[PDB]
Amino acid sequence: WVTVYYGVPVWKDAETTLFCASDHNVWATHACVPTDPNPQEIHLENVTEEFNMWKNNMVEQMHTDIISLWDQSLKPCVKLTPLCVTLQCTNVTNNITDDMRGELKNCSFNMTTELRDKKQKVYSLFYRLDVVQINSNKEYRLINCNTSAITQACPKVSFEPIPIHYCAPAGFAILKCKDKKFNGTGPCPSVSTVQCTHGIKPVVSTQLLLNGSLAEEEVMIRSENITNNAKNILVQFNTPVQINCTRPNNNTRKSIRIGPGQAFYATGDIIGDIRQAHCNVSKATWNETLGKVVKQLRKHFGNNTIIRFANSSGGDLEVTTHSFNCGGEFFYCNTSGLFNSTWIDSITLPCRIKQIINMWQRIGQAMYAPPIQGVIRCVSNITGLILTRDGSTTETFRPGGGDMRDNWRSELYKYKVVKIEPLGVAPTRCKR
Amino acid sequence: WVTVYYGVPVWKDAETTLFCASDHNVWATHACVPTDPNPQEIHLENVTEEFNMWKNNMVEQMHTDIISLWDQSLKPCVKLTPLCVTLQCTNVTNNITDDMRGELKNCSFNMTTELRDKKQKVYSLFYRLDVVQINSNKEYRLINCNTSAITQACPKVSFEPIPIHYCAPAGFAILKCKDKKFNGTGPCPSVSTVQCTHGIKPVVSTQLLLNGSLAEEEVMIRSENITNNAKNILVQFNTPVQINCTRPNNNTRKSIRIGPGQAFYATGDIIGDIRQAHCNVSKATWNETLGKVVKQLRKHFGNNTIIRFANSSGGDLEVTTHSFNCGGEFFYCNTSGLFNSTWIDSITLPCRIKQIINMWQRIGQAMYAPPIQGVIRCVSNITGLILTRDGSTTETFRPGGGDMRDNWRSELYKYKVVKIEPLGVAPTRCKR
Amino acid sequence: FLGFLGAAGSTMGAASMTLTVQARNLLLTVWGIKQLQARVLAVERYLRDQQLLGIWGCSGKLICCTNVPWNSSWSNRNLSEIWDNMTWLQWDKEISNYTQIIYGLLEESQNQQEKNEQDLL
Amino acid sequence: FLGFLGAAGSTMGAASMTLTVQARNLLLTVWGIKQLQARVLAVERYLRDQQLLGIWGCSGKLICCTNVPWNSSWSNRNLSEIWDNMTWLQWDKEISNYTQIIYGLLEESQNQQEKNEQDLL
Amino acid sequence: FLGFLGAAGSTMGAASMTLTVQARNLLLTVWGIKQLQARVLAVERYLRDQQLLGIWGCSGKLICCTNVPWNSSWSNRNLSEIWDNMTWLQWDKEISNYTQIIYGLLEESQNQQEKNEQDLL
Ligand SMILES: *[C@@H]1O[C@H](CO)[C@@H](O[C@@H]2O[C@H](CO)[C@@H](O[C@@H]3O[C@H](CO)[C@@H](O)[C@H](O[C@H]4O[C@H](CO)[C@@H](O)[C@H](O)[C@@H]4O)[C@@H]3O)[C@H](O)[C@H]2NC(C)=O)[C@H](O)[C@H]1NC(C)=O
Ligand SMILES: *[C@@H]1O[C@H](CO)[C@@H](O[C@@H]2O[C@H](CO)[C@@H](O[C@@H]3O[C@H](CO)[C@@H](O)[C@H](O[C@H]4O[C@H](CO)[C@@H](O)[C@H](O)[C@@H]4O)[C@@H]3O)[C@H](O)[C@H]2NC(C)=O)[C@H](O)[C@H]1NC(C)=O
Ligand SMILES: *[C@@H]1O[C@H](CO)[C@@H](O[C@@H]2O[C@H](CO)[C@@H](O)[C@H](O)[C@H]2NC(C)=O)[C@H](O)[C@H]1NC(C)=O
Ligand SMILES: *[C@@H]1O[C@H](CO)[C@@H](O[C@@H]2O[C@H](CO)[C@@H](O)[C@H](O)[C@H]2NC(C)=O)[C@H](O)[C@H]1NC(C)=O
Ligand SMILES: *[C@@H]1O[C@H](CO)[C@@H](O[C@@H]2O[C@H](CO)[C@@H](O)[C@H](O)[C@H]2NC(C)=O)[C@H](O)[C@H]1NC(C)=O
Ligand SMILES: *[C@@H]1O[C@H](CO)[C@@H](O[C@@H]2O[C@H](CO)[C@@H](O)[C@H](O)[C@H]2NC(C)=O)[C@H](O)[C@H]1NC(C)=O
Ligand SMILES: *[C@@H]1O[C@H](CO)[C@@H](O[C@@H]2O[C@H](CO)[C@@H](O)[C@H](O)[C@H]2NC(C)=O)[C@H](O)[C@H]1NC(C)=O
Ligand SMILES: *[C@@H]1O[C@H](CO)[C@@H](O[C@@H]2O[C@H](CO)[C@@H](O)[C@H](O)[C@H]2NC(C)=O)[C@H](O)[C@H]1NC(C)=O
Ligand SMILES: *[C@@H]1O[C@H](CO)[C@@H](O)[C@H](O)[C@H]1NC(C)=O
Ligand SMILES: *[C@@H]1O[C@H](CO)[C@@H](O)[C@H](O)[C@H]1NC(C)=O
Ligand SMILES: *[C@@H]1O[C@H](CO)[C@@H](O)[C@H](O)[C@H]1NC(C)=O
Ligand SMILES: *[C@@H]1O[C@H](CO)[C@@H](O)[C@H](O)[C@H]1NC(C)=O
Ligand SMILES: *[C@@H]1O[C@H](CO)[C@@H](O)[C@H](O)[C@H]1NC(C)=O
Ligand SMILES: *[C@@H]1O[C@H](CO)[C@@H](O)[C@H](O)[C@H]1NC(C)=O
Ligand SMILES: *[C@@H]1O[C@H](CO)[C@@H](O)[C@H](O)[C@H]1NC(C)=O
Ligand SMILES: *[C@@H]1O[C@H](CO)[C@@H](O)[C@H](O)[C@H]1NC(C)=O
Ligand SMILES: *[C@@H]1O[C@H](CO)[C@@H](O)[C@H](O)[C@H]1NC(C)=O
Ligand SMILES: *[C@@H]1O[C@H](CO)[C@@H](O)[C@H](O)[C@H]1NC(C)=O
Ligand SMILES: *[C@@H]1O[C@H](CO)[C@@H](O)[C@H](O)[C@H]1NC(C)=O
Ligand SMILES: *[C@@H]1O[C@H](CO)[C@@H](O)[C@H](O)[C@H]1NC(C)=O
Ligand SMILES: *[C@@H]1O[C@H](CO)[C@@H](O)[C@H](O)[C@H]1NC(C)=O
Ligand SMILES: *[C@@H]1O[C@H](CO)[C@@H](O)[C@H](O)[C@H]1NC(C)=O
Ligand SMILES: *[C@@H]1O[C@H](CO)[C@@H](O)[C@H](O)[C@H]1NC(C)=O
Ligand SMILES: *[C@@H]1O[C@H](CO)[C@@H](O)[C@H](O)[C@H]1NC(C)=O
Ligand SMILES: *[C@@H]1O[C@H](CO)[C@@H](O)[C@H](O)[C@H]1NC(C)=O
Ligand SMILES: *[C@@H]1O[C@H](CO)[C@@H](O)[C@H](O)[C@H]1NC(C)=O
Ligand SMILES: *[C@@H]1O[C@H](CO)[C@@H](O)[C@H](O)[C@H]1NC(C)=O
Ligand SMILES: *[C@@H]1O[C@H](CO)[C@@H](O)[C@H](O)[C@H]1NC(C)=O
Ligand SMILES: *[C@@H]1O[C@H](CO)[C@@H](O)[C@H](O)[C@H]1NC(C)=O
Ligand SMILES: *[C@@H]1O[C@H](CO)[C@@H](O)[C@H](O)[C@H]1NC(C)=O
Ligand SMILES: *[C@@H]1O[C@H](CO)[C@@H](O)[C@H](O)[C@H]1NC(C)=O
Ligand SMILES: *[C@@H]1O[C@H](CO)[C@@H](O)[C@H](O)[C@H]1NC(C)=O
Ligand SMILES: *[C@@H]1O[C@H](CO)[C@@H](O)[C@H](O)[C@H]1NC(C)=O
Ligand SMILES: *[C@@H]1O[C@H](CO)[C@@H](O)[C@H](O)[C@H]1NC(C)=O
């Protein structure tokens, strides 16, 4: 009566190590398996499977993997310890639009040379957000000097968010939920098995989610607990909103030798006049999009409820603004022009730029972003929002963010890792 | 006639790699397998097995593992190269007990600041054992400046000797000798198989063995060759002797910034008066214990022999004194008050303290032990001794030590690693 | 027909014809460690199942008919429900609590058989 | 009853009923290398014994009765002494010097058998 | 006689008596990774061949006579040419394009056999 079967199509939830695959990058370069040019996906008929995007350890793994790859890419680069000196700074007043008076400072300092005996007097431009006034009212120091060592990113390694595919090891499988209008938790029909995930771009941003995937039919609202105001709400758009960002300044770059085989890349004089960096969002598109978002929020909050959007609360720059990296420079844009309405040309968002960057929420490892020569122009898709609810006849939604796991959870929500368990026994009418 | 059997309970002596397991530590933290909450031990009936504690490679492995873990815990910490400067030192003469006049020096120096342009004048207290007079009679340098780079231990990582269990890989087994009155060599009955060793605390000490295991019935004397005066004698007690050590000085600590993200922890002024560090051993307990040791030594040296104890011979501080780490500070205590007798209240042992430590017998890697704020009090068990015989009617025993393998050999003496060999053949009365 | 796990939603007797489909899918130094650990584990898991089939006398088979009777207390169902209505995922849940009992019995009956076969030679 | 190696002090015929007990127990990057090497070795040792049983025609068995005669020069003892008085540890020492001879003979007889079975089909 | 691959230039029927000779030869952290990868791969390659023999019903054998007919389109030669004139290296080239067809057929016939044997019990 007992018959043993091996190769039985049974699985259990499991947490394992996934490996990366992909078709001078900060993240995945050579430590990544070439992808399968003809990947498979198998539809599983009559399979209902429970998914929970808020407990998905693929997110924790991705967070850990990208941070470690990031650090490995700074490890061999030039340290800028010699730059942590007293600076003598004045204002850049040459052809400055009123909007930027005080934003750029012209600083001189005594830098070391290749020889240990000699020093050189050099100058460069810094943003006001990169320096601290000390004491002598022209004396400044870099912002990180009392907190952390700073290194220069190697200007050959790019920050382009090249897509990574996650693949399961043998004995494991990745299940994908194809059920349209899946809200992140509970069971879903229409489950398929895949070898690997689709390519996911490690785009880093706050408030607005850029260059991601879109919803199949409708704008979707997802949260761990929709009635808990301490939780974030992820909003996935079914149409992109195009955003155009730029740094309209023809910057030049100069190389300052600071040692035997090391150099610092400094911002030199700027060609032409000085203008503020900014991003443009089409007003009509934004308004239609915001329209769709409200219609869906009413499903949880009441169709006679007043829904108001408001700008962000206070906090540091990295939290209250829309942070992104484009063209090699780090932008901090003011989104109060997007989230200012009750219920539901172009909208111009002013932006600030920094050279000294503290990534994620870490303290102790700062990096200096070398300047980029010429003018930067970026075009990207807003594919979703991160909102936080401020909370009796009205609800206020504000931009949220700062926790990078929320930006990956939004792409990995469809995937689950399971372990295959091929042995099983069942009664049969036979005897050895 | 030949029948092949697989799974036969046969083993051979073997040397393999064992892994660690355990229930911000210097040694085992995350690179350690969680232990089995319900470990097994199997008694082997009718098995006699030969053990030799002096040829046990588990000891060599442990020695190598603890040194490597130690180094990995200093690798990310602050280097104190900028501290290797000329110091201007005077004596601390404020409320000093006569016993410590000249022990503490108040030294000033020019230290760097976060900025490369500026220097600061700072001062700190050092022990006389940490500095060298040079040349100008107030000029000193740190002791390690002509020999080695020095790093500061990170004051968040503890030196607490948290127990480690060694476990065999599959295909191997650890045999344990449970024969009471086993002297380290030769065969023993009463052998059991265990998954892992008991937890062994990596306590570092000289002369006296602290916080270890005790003998089951009697004090035991073990040596590689009891008639060879070049060998050490390990004495295991069957009762602990309690020892109470303290540093009765309310020290304060100050943080001196020495660079962009780095700081030095200096000893600041001392609150209250200045007193000598010391350890207390109960006299009656020590005398009873020493009694038992002599009774057992007579089994090898004659019961009409005069047995004398004497203090240590000369050599460096690390060898001639009882070295230990407690409360985060390194003590060097004078044990001449314990080993001063022919044949067989409290005994106070004065102690010296150092901040610059050269671990084990290595040269080139020195560490600076940050000071501990407040008063330190430690209570520990003396569980054994390391003696060396000075050698016609009398024998003199002196404290020995300095080779750390002797402190692990005393815990691992019961364990042996063997390799399982599951195939075998034997005659049977059958044919295929 | 179907690929890996395609039969997962099929009934137990519809599945179990696809056993080879699943059987064949079981097969910067820090990055390298992560990948080696994944590969070593896949091998260790594979070998443990093979060792277990071996001691039950089912080595080399995908379907192995044994000599242990089914206890109705493990699952009181007729062959029609088990093989025609249920899927393997449902079955695995139904008798999860009896798996170790069954495995112990399978080992014991093989030990008895293996010795009887020696005495007959 | 007894666990791993519990039968080590038992006689050869008392032991050899516990073969599954022992068979189932055979299964910071630098720290990681040490652990991976230990795991890889356990697998390689396991597989070498399995390959060897395979070429002798004993695959999947714990007790395998072969067709090679016992040479009294290897050990001139009766079954009563070998199976009732001796332990496996003692036996392994007694015939250590003949192990490679026996293994060579086992391989040869299987090669002859394997070919005879082809000619008969 | 000959050691590893010594029979490589021998004819197919002269070789194939040496199957155990070849079967037994299949078995600074960065340096350590390179060596572990080499060892892990040797194990994975070994196991894949063993799994494949298993699903064809040839587990534990070096010579396995199957129940799949030879299609003359794969190689229209008589036994005399194949076993007495050709070497295994030449043969492997001659039927390289049919290897996957043959392997698929071997899997299918085993699945049919395995089920027939269940129905007969
Ligand atoms: C959202 O997706 C869009 C589309 O994929 C993406 O925009 C792309 O950004 C990259 C980088 O800013 C652009 O690539 C540049 O194109 C100019 C064209 O002349 C080149 O000159 C640039 O070359 C320099 O940088 C290279 C970096 O490796 C150097 O190797 C080279 O020597 C030069 O220094 C560079 O190729 C790309 O063209 C746009 N794509 C489009 C269609 O505009 C956008 O950034 C994504 N958004 C976010 C926030 O990630
Ligand atoms: C022999 O064994 C004994 C008993 O196990 C052992 O004594 C223990 O030493 C440790 C360290 O000296 C003591 O732990 C301290 O207890 C005080 C009590 O108030 C705490 O304040 C201390 O906290 C500080 O240090 C921590 C280190 O991680 C910091 O995290 C913390 O923020 C503070 O800075 C600390 O916990 C322990 O109490 C004694 N045990 C007893 C019973 O006294 C002894 O040292 C061993 N002997 C040797 C030589 O190893
Ligand atoms: C930043 O300050 C430097 C130093 O004053 C300016 O460069 C000087 O410009 C005058 C104009 O004729 C030259 O004569 C000097 O020789 C320049 N100095 C050096 C060191 O080259 C610089 O133009 C200022 N930059 C900005 C953007 O204001
Ligand atoms: C983001 O842009 C808005 C819009 O220009 C800025 O809003 C102004 O903030 C000051 C602060 O007191 C108010 O007095 C002004 O009335 C605001 N403008 C409007 C139109 O109401 C906002 O400060 C910017 N945020 C940051 C961080 O700079
Ligand atoms: C913004 O979203 C649009 C719409 O999804 C993207 O354009 C599509 O890109 C896919 C890629 O193969 C094409 O097949 C579609 O035909 C494109 N749609 C249109 C209307 O052209 C667009 O590329 C996205 N932009 C970014 C920066 O990713
Ligand atoms: C170590 O030397 C310093 C320097 O002389 C002593 O600190 C000075 O104490 C006097 C007493 O009034 C103060 O006025 C000075 O301002 C102190 N100097 C500094 C730099 O603070 C210090 O007390 C001495 N410490 C010991 C333990 O003797
Ligand atoms: C350890 O303590 C003993 C006891 O106080 C010290 O012994 C003294 O050493 C000097 C050296 O010549 C002798 O003259 C004294 O007579 C000794 N005292 C006694 C009571 O005999 C010993 O020096 C200390 N050891 C160290 C290394 O400081
Ligand atoms: C010193 O030795 C004593 C005696 O062995 C230790 O106290 C025993 O600790 C065990 C641990 O579970 C208890 O079960 C015993 O009951 C304790 N004995 C007594 C008399 O209380 C003591 O902990 C040791 N001290 C140190 C620092 O390890
Ligand atoms: C402003 O721009 C004009 C463009 O011709 C340039 O000539 C002028 O020097 C600039 N002004 C300053 C102060 O540099
Ligand atoms: C460079 O060093 C000299 C030395 O006196 C100093 O006067 C000068 O101000 C320094 N330059 C800067 C820009 O700090
Ligand atoms: C998501 O769908 C599940 C299905 O039952 C439901 O229970 C859950 O509450 C939904 N999420 C929200 C935010 O309502
Ligand atoms: C959501 O948060 C509220 C806050 O009290 C809590 O009562 C409720 O149970 C939470 N919902 C779930 C599904 O846990
Ligand atoms: C962005 O640039 C494209 C052309 O590159 C233009 O068609 C589009 O309207 C721009 N978007 C906005 C919001 O200005
Ligand atoms: C957004 O769309 C709604 C649709 O009713 C319209 O009433 C509202 O005025 C629009 N807002 C803007 C800024 O055009
Ligand atoms: C949001 O808008 C208010 C309007 O008064 C402004 O004061 C506040 O600073 C804005 N928040 C941010 C982060 O700009
Ligand atoms: C928000 O909308 C009101 C409506 O007129 C407008 O006055 C205000 O300036 C808007 N805020 C921003 C930041 O544009
Ligand atoms: C000695 O201790 C007393 C305690 O009151 C303190 O007041 C005095 O200043 C100390 N002496 C010196 C020289 O610091
Ligand atoms: C610090 O540097 C000055 C430079 O002249 C020197 O005179 C002084 O003695 C130094 N301080 C110490 C404590 O060595
Ligand atoms: C330890 O016991 C063995 C048992 O024969 C003995 O030979 C050996 O000499 C003993 N050790 C000492 C120090 O005598
Ligand atoms: C112990 O050392 C003495 C010193 O000569 C030597 O003669 C004796 O043989 C040694 N004992 C052993 C057991 O080796
Ligand atoms: C050590 O301290 C304990 C109390 O903590 C005390 O009972 C014991 O007698 C002390 N030992 C000595 C040797 O003073
Ligand atoms: C130690 O014990 C012995 C026991 O006879 C005694 O004679 C001796 O005086 C004791 N020593 C001390 C210091 O009490
Ligand atoms: C030492 O004790 C043993 C124990 O039997 C005894 O035979 C021997 O004569 C004793 N020696 C002396 C000197 O008393
Ligand atoms: C041992 O005691 C003698 C007594 O004269 C002393 O001279 C010697 O220095 C002591 N040894 C140590 C290491 O203190
Ligand atoms: C050793 O014992 C003698 C006996 O009186 C004593 O005088 C001497 O001071 C002792 N040595 C130490 C270090 O206490
Ligand atoms: C899914 O259920 C339907 C119900 O009849 C069945 O026909 C179909 O074959 C099932 N799927 C699979 C893979 O068998
Ligand atoms: C069947 O299982 C029950 C418990 O599950 C047990 O009591 C009973 O004895 C078993 N039947 C047989 C024949 O072993
Ligand atoms: C298996 O154990 C669980 C434990 O809660 C129990 O609920 C379940 O009913 C058991 N299954 C069977 C078939 O008895
Ligand atoms: C140990 O020897 C005794 C001697 O009769 C035997 O009875 C016992 O069973 C043996 N141990 C084992 C595990 O069989
Ligand atoms: C038995 O072994 C001996 C040597 O061990 C050998 O000479 C003899 O020929 C062997 N007997 C047979 C029948 O092979
Ligand atoms: C096995 O070889 C050793 C080598 O010294 C020899 O002493 C032993 O007697 C041999 N064993 C047999 C059973 O002949
Ligand atoms: C090589 O070819 C010759 C040709 O007759 C043959 O005799 C010889 O045996 C061949 N080599 C081997 C290894 O068989
Ligand atoms: C033999 O192979 C040919 C193609 O290689 C195929 O068409 C033919 O049907 C096969 N014969 C049989 C009996 O399957
Ligand atoms: C195998 O495929 C190659 C591809 O070029 C072809 O040339 C060769 O003839 C084929 N082999 C046979 C036996 O048909």
Secondary structure, 3-state, chain A = CEEEEECCCCEEECCCCCEEEECCECCCCCCCEECCCCCCEEEECCCCEEEEHHHCHHHHHHHHHHHHHHHHCCCCCCECHHHCCCEEEEECCCCECHHHCCCEEEEEEEEECCCCCCEEEEEEEEEHHHEEECCCCCEEEEHHHHCCEEEECCCCCECCCCCEEEECCCCEEEEEECCCCCCCEEEECCEEEECECCCECCCCECCEEECCCCCCCCCEEEECCCCCCCCEEEEEEEEEEEEEEEEEEEEEEEEEEEECCEEEEEEEEEECCECCCEEEECHHHHHHHHHHHHHHHHHHHCCCCEEEECCCCCCCHHHHCEEEEECCEEEEECCCCCCCEECCCCEEEEEEEECEEECCCCCCEEEECCCCCEEEEEEEEEEEEEEEEECCCEEEEEECCCCCCHHHHHHHCCEEEEEECCEEEEECCCCC
Query: Residue whose CA is closest, atom 4 of ligand 29?
Result: B46
Q: Quote the CA–CA distance of B432 and B368 in Å, as a whole number.
A: 73
Q: How many CB pairs under 8 A join A and E?
A: 7
Rounded Cα gap, residues B376 and B329, in angstroms: 9
**Does the CB atom of residue C3 touch ligand 26 within 6 A?**
no
- C38–chain D nearest CA distance, Å: 11
- Name the token pair of D69: 């005669």
What value does the CA radius of gyration of chain A take, rounded to a whole number of Å? Answer: 26
Residue that the structure tokens 């901090």 belong to: A332
Distance CA B110, CA A311 (A): 51
DSSP state of D7: G
User: How far is it, in rounded angstroms, from Cα B161 to Cα A403?
Assistant: 37
User: Cβ contact (<8 Å) for B42 and D2?
Assistant: yes
Residue E118 to residue A431, Cβ atoms within 8 A: no
Helix, strand or coil, per DSSP, at residue B187: strand
Do residues C49 and A6 touch, judged by C-beta distance below 8 A?
yes
User: In which element (H, E) is residue B134 found?
Assistant: none
Handedness of CA C84, C85, C89, C91 (dihedral sign): negative
Q: If DSSP codes are grouped into helix, strand and coil, which group holds residue D112?
A: helix
**Beta strand segments in B129-168, E:** 131-133, 139-142, 149-152, 165-167
E1 touches chain D (CB under 8 A): no
The method of structure determination was cryo-EM
Kindly give the distance from the C-alpha atom of residue A239 to the centroid of ligand 14, in angstroms, as a whole number: 18
State the distance from the centre of ligand 30 to the C-alpha of D63, rounded, in angstroms.
Answer: 25
Residue D70: both structure tokens together: 């016992």
D59/B339 Cα distance (integer angstroms): 67
CB B407 within 8 Å of CB B419: no
Tell me the backbone φ, ψ of residue A161, rounded to 5 degrees: -80, 70
A225 lines ligand 12 (CB under 6 A): yes
DSSP string, chain C: ---TTGGGGSBTTTSSS-HHHHHTT---HHHHHHHHHHHHHHHHHHHHHHHHHHHTT-TT-SEEE-SPPPPTTT----HIIIIII-BHHHHHHHTGGGHHHHHHHHHHHHHHHHHHHHHT-
- Cβ of residue A108 lying under 6 Å from some atom of ligand 10: yes
Query: Cα(A120)–Cα(A266) distance, rounded to whole angstroms?
Result: 14
d(CA B33, CA A363): 30
**Which pair of structure tokens corresponds to residue B299?**
């089994």
A348 close to ligand 16 (CB < 6 Angstrom): no
Q: Which residues of E touch A3 (CB under 8 A)?
A: 118
Q: What are the two backbone dihedrals, phi and then psi, of residue B330, each rounded to the nearest 5 degrees?
A: -95, 115
The Cα B393–Cα B303 span in angstroms is 11
Residue A367 to residue A155: CA distance in whole angstroms? 12
> Chain B partners of A148 at a C-beta cutoff of 8 Å?
260-261
Provide, as residue numbers in chain C, all residues whose Cβ is less than 8 Å from the Cβ of A193: 3-5
> Scanning every residue of chain B, which has its alpha carbon at the shortest distance from the alpha carbon of C120?
B430
Question: Which residue's alpha carbon is at the smallest distance from atom 1 of ligand 2?
Answer: B380
B67-72 LR contacts (CB < 8 Å, sep 24+)? B67/B359, B67/B360, B68/D30, B69/B26, B69/B27, B69/B28, B70/B26, B70/B27, B70/B359, B71/B365, B72/D28
* Dist. CA B92 → ligand 6 center (Å): 10
- C-alpha R_g of chain E: 18
In chain D, the N- to C-terminal Cα span, in Å, equals: 46
What backbone phi and psi angles, to 5 degrees, belong to A27? -95, -100
- Index of the ligand 22 atom closest to the CA of residue B284: 14
Residue B105: what residue type?
A: K
Helix (H, G, I), strand (E, B) or coil at B411: helix
Q: How far is the CA of B269 from the centre of ligand 6 (A)?
A: 8
From the list A356, A103, A373, A130, the residue with the least C-alpha distance to A252 is: A373
Instruction: Closest CB to B9: pick one of D15, D34, D106.
Output: D15
Contact A356, A131 (CB under 8 A): no
Q: What is the token pair recorded at A320?
A: 């209250």
Q: Phi, psi (5° rounding) for residue A336? A: -65, -20
Tokens found for residue A281: 């969002």
The structure tokens listed for B391 are 């050698």
Residue A325, φ and ψ in degrees, nearest 5 = -110, 115
State how far the Cα of C91 lies from the Cα of C81, in Å rounded to an integer: 10
The C-alpha atoms of residue B249 and residue B351 are separated, in whole angstroms, by 13
Tell me if D5 sits within 8 A of B42, measured CB to CB. Answer: yes
Query: Contact, A144 vs A150, CB < 8 A?
Result: yes
Q: Is B52 helix (H, G, I), strand (E, B) or coil?
A: strand
> Would strands A329-333 and A347-354 be described as parallel, antiparallel, or unpaired?
antiparallel
R_g of chain C computed on alpha carbons: 18
The best mutation among A285, A286, A287, A292 to test binding of ligand 14, ranked by most ligand atoms within 8 Å of the C-beta, falls on: A287
Contact at 8 Å (CB) between B84 and B142? yes
CB B428 within 8 A of CB B3: yes
B285 lines ligand 22 (CB under 6 A): no
**Residue D28: both structure tokens together:** 């910071």
Cβ–Cβ gap C63/A5 under 8 Å? yes
Q: What is the rounded distance in angstroms from the CA atom of residue A85 to the CA atom of residue A132?
A: 12
Q: Which residues of D touch C34 (CB under 8 A)?
A: none
In degrees rounded to 5, what are phi and psi of residue D91? -65, -45
Nearest Cα to Cα of residue B221 among B416, B412, B415, B410:
B410
Q: Which residue's C-alpha comes closest to atom 7 of ligand 30?
A: D73
- The overall longest dimension of chain E from CA atoms, in Å, is 60
Q: How many CB atoms lie within 10 A of CB B380?
A: 19
B interface residues, D as partner, C-beta within 8 Å: 1-11, 16-17, 19, 30-31, 40, 42-47, 68, 72, 169-171, 173, 193, 420-432
Q: Among positive and negative, which fits the CA dihedral B29, B33, B34, B37?
A: negative
Closest to A74 in 3D by CA, of A150, A153, A155, A144? A153
Q: Which amino acid is at B19?
A: F
- Chains E and B touch each other (3 or more Cβ pairs < 8 A): no
Rounded to whole angstroms, how far apart are CA atoms A144 and A130? 8
CA proximity to A432, closest of C56, D20, C80: C56
Q: Does C29 touch chain E (CB under 8 A)?
A: yes
Paired strand residues for B341? B309
Cα of A12 vs its chain's centroid, Å: 32
B306-309 and B394-399 strand pairing: parallel
What Cα–Cα distance (Å) separates residue D117 from each residue in A45, B106, B416, E78, E85? 46, 94, 48, 22, 24
C30 in reach of chain E (CB within 8 A): no
Pairing label, strands B104-112, B119-127:
antiparallel
Supply A11's token pair: 């699985």
Q: Does B342 sit in the ligand 25 pocket, CB within 6 Å?
A: no
Distance between Cα A119 and ligand 24 center (Å): 57
Tell whether D33 lies on the interface with E, counting CB pairs under 8 A: yes
Q: How far apart are CA D17 and CA A345, in angstroms?
A: 88
List the structure tokens of D84.
């009732």
User: How many whole angstroms separate alpha carbon E111 and alpha carbon A272?
Assistant: 78
Burial track E69-89 (b if 16+ CB lie within 10 A, e otherwise): eeeeeeeeeeeeebbeebeee
Q: How far apart are CA C60 and CA D59, in angstroms?
A: 9
CA of C54: how far to CAs of A136, B230, C60, E61, in Å? 84, 56, 8, 16
The rounded distance, in Å, linking the Cα atoms of D91 and D82 is 8
Question: E7 alpha carbon to ligand 2 midpoint, in Å?
Answer: 71
- Three-state SS letters, D17-78: CCHHHHHCCCCCHHHHHHHHHHHHHHHHHHHHHHHHHHHCCCCCCCEEECCCCCCCCCCCCC
- A185 C-alpha to ligand 5 centroid (Å): 28
Q: Name the residue with tokens 């060999």.
A: B421
Positive or negative, the Cα torsion across E84, E86, E92, E93? Answer: negative
